[PDB]
Write an enzyme that holds these catalytic residues in place. Sequence first.
Site, PDB file in Angstrom:
ATOM      1  NE  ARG A   1      60.701  62.241  39.738  1.00 57.99           N
ATOM      2  CZ  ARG A   1      61.233  63.138  40.536  1.00 57.99           C
ATOM      3  NH1 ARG A   1      60.999  63.124  41.819  1.00 57.99           N
ATOM      4  NH2 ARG A   1      62.002  64.058  40.034  1.00 57.99           N
TER       5      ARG A   1
ATOM      6  CG  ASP B   1      59.689  51.040  41.418  1.00 56.72           C
ATOM      7  OD1 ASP B   1      60.021  50.184  42.249  1.00 56.72           O
ATOM      8  OD2 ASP B   1      60.527  51.688  40.775  1.00 56.72           O
TER       9      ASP B   1
ATOM     10  CD  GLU C   1      60.104  57.256  46.333  1.00 60.48           C
ATOM     11  OE1 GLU C   1      59.008  57.043  45.760  1.00 60.48           O
ATOM     12  OE2 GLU C   1      61.203  56.840  45.907  1.00 60.48           O
TER      13      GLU C   1
ATOM     14  CG  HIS D   1      62.086  54.679  43.143  1.00 61.40           C
ATOM     15  ND1 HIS D   1      61.125  55.625  43.360  1.00 61.40           N
ATOM     16  CD2 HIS D   1      62.592  54.948  41.929  1.00 61.40           C
ATOM     17  CE1 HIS D   1      61.046  56.427  42.325  1.00 61.40           C
ATOM     18  NE2 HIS D   1      61.924  56.034  41.439  1.00 61.40           N
TER      19      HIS D   1
END
Lengths: 321, 331, 328, 328
Positions: free
Chosen positions: C234, C258, C263, C295
Amino acid sequence: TKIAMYNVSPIEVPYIEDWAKKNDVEIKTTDQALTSATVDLAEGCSSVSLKPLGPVDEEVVYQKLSEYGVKCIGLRINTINFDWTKLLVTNVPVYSPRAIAEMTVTQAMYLLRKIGEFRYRMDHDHDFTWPSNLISNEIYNLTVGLIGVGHIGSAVAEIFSAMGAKVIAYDVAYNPEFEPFLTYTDFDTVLKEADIVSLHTPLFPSTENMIGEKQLKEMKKSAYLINCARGELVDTGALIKALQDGEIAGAGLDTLAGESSYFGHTGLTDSEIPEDYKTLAKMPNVVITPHSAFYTETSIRNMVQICLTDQLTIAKGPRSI
Amino acid sequence: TKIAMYNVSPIEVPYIEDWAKKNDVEIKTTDQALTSATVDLAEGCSSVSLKPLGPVDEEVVYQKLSEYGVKCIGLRIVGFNTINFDWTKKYNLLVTNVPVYSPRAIAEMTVTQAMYLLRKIGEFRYRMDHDHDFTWPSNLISNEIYNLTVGLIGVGHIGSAVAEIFSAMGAKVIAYDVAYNPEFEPFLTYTDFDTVLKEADIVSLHTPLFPSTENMIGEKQLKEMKKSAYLINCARGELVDTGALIKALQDGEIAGAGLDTLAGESSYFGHTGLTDSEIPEDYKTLAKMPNVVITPHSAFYTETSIRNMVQICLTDQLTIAKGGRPRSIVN
Amino acid sequence: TKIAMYNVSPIEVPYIEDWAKKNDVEIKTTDQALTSATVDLAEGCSSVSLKPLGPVDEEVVYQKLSEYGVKCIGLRIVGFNTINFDWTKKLLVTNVPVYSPRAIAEMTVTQAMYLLRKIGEFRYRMDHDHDFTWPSNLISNEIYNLTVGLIGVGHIGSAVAEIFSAMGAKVIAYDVAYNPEFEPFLTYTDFDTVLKEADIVSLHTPLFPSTENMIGEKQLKEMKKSAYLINCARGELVDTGALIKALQDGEIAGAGLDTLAGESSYFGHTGLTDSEIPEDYKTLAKMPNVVITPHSAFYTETSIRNMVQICLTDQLTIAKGGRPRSIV
Amino acid sequence: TKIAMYNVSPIEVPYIEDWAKKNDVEIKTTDQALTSATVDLAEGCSSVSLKPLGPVDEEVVYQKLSEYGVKCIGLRIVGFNTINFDWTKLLVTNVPVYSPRAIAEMTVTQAMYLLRKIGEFRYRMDHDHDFTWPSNLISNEIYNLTVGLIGVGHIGSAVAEIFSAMGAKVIAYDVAYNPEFEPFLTYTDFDTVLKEADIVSLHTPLFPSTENMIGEKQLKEMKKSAYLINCARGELVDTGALIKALQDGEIAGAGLDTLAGESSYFGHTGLTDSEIPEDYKTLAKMPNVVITPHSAFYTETSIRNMVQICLTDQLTIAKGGRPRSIVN
Ligand SMILES: NC(=O)c1ccc[n+]([C@@H]2O[C@H](COP(=O)([O-])OP(=O)(O)OC[C@H]3O[C@@H](n4cnc5c(N)ncnc54)[C@H](O)[C@@H]3O)[C@@H](O)[C@H]2O)c1
Ligand SMILES: NC(=O)c1ccc[n+]([C@@H]2O[C@H](COP(=O)([O-])OP(=O)(O)OC[C@H]3O[C@@H](n4cnc5c(N)ncnc54)[C@H](O)[C@@H]3O)[C@@H](O)[C@H]2O)c1
Ligand SMILES: NC(=O)c1ccc[n+]([C@@H]2O[C@H](COP(=O)([O-])OP(=O)(O)OC[C@H]3O[C@@H](n4cnc5c(N)ncnc54)[C@H](O)[C@@H]3O)[C@@H](O)[C@H]2O)c1
Ligand SMILES: NC(=O)c1ccc[n+]([C@@H]2O[C@H](COP(=O)([O-])OP(=O)(O)OC[C@H]3O[C@@H](n4cnc5c(N)ncnc54)[C@H](O)[C@@H]3O)[C@@H](O)[C@H]2O)c1
């Protein structure tokens, strides 16, 4: 804050005292079970800790617990009457999957390398040669089938897979995190294709005598059966017939149905050990251990320690309930 | 192109035909030794192949081999003591052997012996059968293998395979070798000999047998080991001084031992119809010990091994027929 | 029996259609979210099934659900927070907690190996400087000589630990909770030591207020200069301002991400203007010792399959008065 | 016992000196090639050590070496083509195995990056401003995939062990059989590896018979979805064919550490456009290709071993040894 323990073995004592001083808590202990004749020990203590050999049936025990200020009964391992409890109960769901996994792998390799059979030939026949029927094979050429995969089952999977073996498994529950080590499939496919078959399901009525006559004829004639779970899973008489008539090649057991008669006791007569044990115990292609798969330092350490750290967080506000 | 096979046992026969069809080669076979009597069979063959039970004693055999035009004598075993090299040069005859056929065969026996001992299985069985005692004593508590360090003496084909497995299971592996092989660093850590002995929970031998390696494990070496530790010898008996090992186990210098091989074994291993006289007290003393496990030099004894001893041998000869010169040549 | 599905994407369909023909079950689907309008396809259904991007914030939706004899709302993801639970006193709710940990484990490992091998850095000198030499400061090492550190070890952390250990690396870890089953792959230790000792630091805890901005200036300074930070968890666990400052100064050697704080603006979006895309993303994405993915650590066939199938199977269990463990 | 060393680079210096100190030997060094000016350095010395970029083809140096009484020329690489064997008639040694896992690990790194489509995601993010997840960039866990190896020696076997540990099926073609290797892979024929692999990795040496081993016909045999990895030698692949195959969708991508024709530009700076080829530039622009500049070897371990294996070899020589690294 004070704790009172019950059922303690000398092997458990060091880890208690090693914890007592580490977590700065006063501890009172004893080898005897919790009964009405031993509840008085729990004066003061925040929690009682037990590792039961039997039901704590009588129920003034519980009365006396909560009157003394006990907040919790924490087990180190169904032997607790849940109606009288309404005190918190705890258990130790996971202490060392790898201990039992490791016994499973050990017993399977011994049999596979046919060590029991060579020693019979050597010691009873004085025969040190290599017969055709005692040839072996590498683990990576074999395929292992697991009936049930939980904490213990999957560790067995991770080990064998690490050694290059194909592992296949039947379970009523799909866990995706296990897919790197095994292929899920049905029960029957597991029995048919598998060169080693290992039991790792729980004990329930629907699971009693899971493996009997049908199942054994369904296995490969060259296969080994391993049970390091519960004896009541295997129909023993059936096992013994299967082995005599060679419907399997061998069996590794850490447990047997009706084992409490003699497992855990010492100094028994011939008459107090059952004939089925004596029969298996004599077969060079079988290995038996006295329900000891759990028996590593890690297991003893975590059985005691997990529970005591639990008990400290309950003397204030964990998943063990 | 033709090859003559000697000493074939039933168990080999299916690997033989299997190989004669994959390649375009005609094979004559006999379960008999190569002597002056049976050398005939070698007619018009590029190679003969053996698995001898004894020396190839007769000069006549070698002379008549090169006169047939047989290029090479292939052994299906590491050992070449049974071949006379004076006569192979005198008769311009190549010789090959099979040194590596299935390293995991042996490595897996090694692990297997270690784990059995580690889990005190034979020691429980003892209490069970003879003390009618099914309880868990304190001194028979076990540990998981990821908590132990395993120590290898000699890390070649077999050792490295032992290293990869015990490393896959999470043990720390340390080893002593005279030769440095970078290949093996993911699975072990090199150290010196003294350290291996001192620090290891399991010491397993995997060095070849040389004059300088005979009795490598003796009294002084068992003193340096841990009380809790186990000695594994699935290599060669002569590496270990048995008298000393017996004493060390009796005195509780180490905890146990797994043995695939003994010094002086050849007069009983692979014999039947033995009488008590002919099995030594050496073996007998060890064999009653619940914390000892012994196999009759069967670590190699897997289907792969038997197959590979046929096929690695036969394809070597196929490359000699073609003009090849393989690295299995004994010089 | 009947089930209706929302938020379905073309990649999901085959799996749904596979499950459907296997369990003998009628499924109607729609790419769009559950709302006042689209609640009309949930007629006769034992269940609804969602992969939501927004709150289901309208009361009417819930009322008509329990008006149609809808037994459960089943999520195909972990986060049940897009549901109002006051109004679910009308409705059961299931989720899919674990669908494929290795999917995320394999992305973590991949990003680490890439930075450890310095490929983005090589490609930078190749493509921009026309330089194909091998300088001192681009030397690499073998994974088995490195020690990898995990802040948090659940289903994903443990998988990550299983892999690196399998490749011969040492793994250390900090967790609030002890999992004896993970000892074959790692050594537990304290938060500080993980950071001080690691050569690759990877993060696997969950987002909580007490966990938010877990990694800032102080912590990046404590890491090794030569260390690499991996975040496939996260983004709000990492202070992007601090990260950039650490990367620019040589306090850490690189980072694989990621996920990123903020975001939701641009992850999941197309045709974006350069305004719509923030300056911190553009700064990290320009560094050769950074790698970023949008992600998609989760994004495999197994995860897509399991997100659909575990959820459906649960609904079916509940169509027969089931109660499976994924009730939330 | 004194040693001359040539071609040393800053990175080697520490292990040179650390080894010099460990054994009672004196080393002298210089970063340039051994030619007829710098030959003078090897006076009093027992051996020389080079790591060549082009041929030692001056005959004086050879006879100037044996006059000074040097016993061997030790190389710090596998390649011995640069020494003229006519003039050694002097011994010659090379270092054939210094760190197989350094290359096997590059092989794995490149393959996972491709498998996870990171290049393809970065392309959509930075040039299309698109941060969504499309059907065709769904990925898969490695344990669900099968890996094909052409050639299995020191390096290919390490690749097998690693991917095996990750749970992939490994299948391989080799002309030689290695029982040692069966726990990690299943041997088969060449065609089959190409037909059934989700990743094809090349690990054979380069020989007249092996040059252009992967060309038009072979890439047609592979799967639409397979990746080709070449961390071996570049002449093993037909770059024209590979480029056209990537363009036509015959394979899904490639990971290259080496290219047919590289010695023109690999290990050079700073070059003109005319000097970096069309094929290289074509490949470099493809988001589904990854290329590193023959850096697979480039680790701490490698550097160290290249130096220390050669030097100890030279010491066994001065004492009368003649070890197996001698190539005549
Ligand atoms: N031998 C010893 O010393 C020892 C010590 C501890 C535990 N055990 C035994 O090991 C066995 C496994 O324990 P665990 O820790 O893995 O617990 P577990 O609950 O994690 O494992 C059981 C697994 O079997 C599955 N299962 C349930 N019913 C099934 C069925 N009918 N058919 C097939 N699979 C079914 C479950 O889904 C679960 O994943 C238990 O029976 C336990 O008593 C033995
Ligand atoms: N039990 C069986 O059936 C069986 C079968 C095959 C081999 N073996 C025995 O196993 C042993 C090893 O087999 P292998 O195939 O691995 O041999 P190998 O040549 O492949 O490996 C031997 C290793 O020992 C090292 N070594 C040599 N001298 C040493 C010393 N003094 N100290 C430490 N290390 C030293 C070598 O460098 C080499 O790495 C041999 O003795 C072999 O005969 C037993
Ligand atoms: N990249 C993706 O697309 C993706 C996909 C799935 C999950 N994730 C993220 O992966 C992370 C981990 O998921 P998981 O399934 O492994 O979760 P988990 O709950 O199974 O594991 C979390 C572990 O966190 C440990 N933990 C919790 N709080 C902690 C704390 N404060 N300090 C230290 N340790 C703590 C707990 O012991 C638990 O074992 C989560 O952030 C999840 O959201 C990302
Ligand atoms: N990327 C780098 O920087 C780097 C570094 C070192 C080595 N390499 C290259 O990697 C390759 C392999 O190295 P290695 O150390 O593994 O060498 P190796 O000698 O150990 O192995 C080569 C293997 O190829 C097999 N082989 C030979 N011919 C074959 C054929 N026609 N078809 C299939 N298999 C065949 C051989 O049996 C052998 O097993 C070599 O080309 C080497 O040049 C690259």
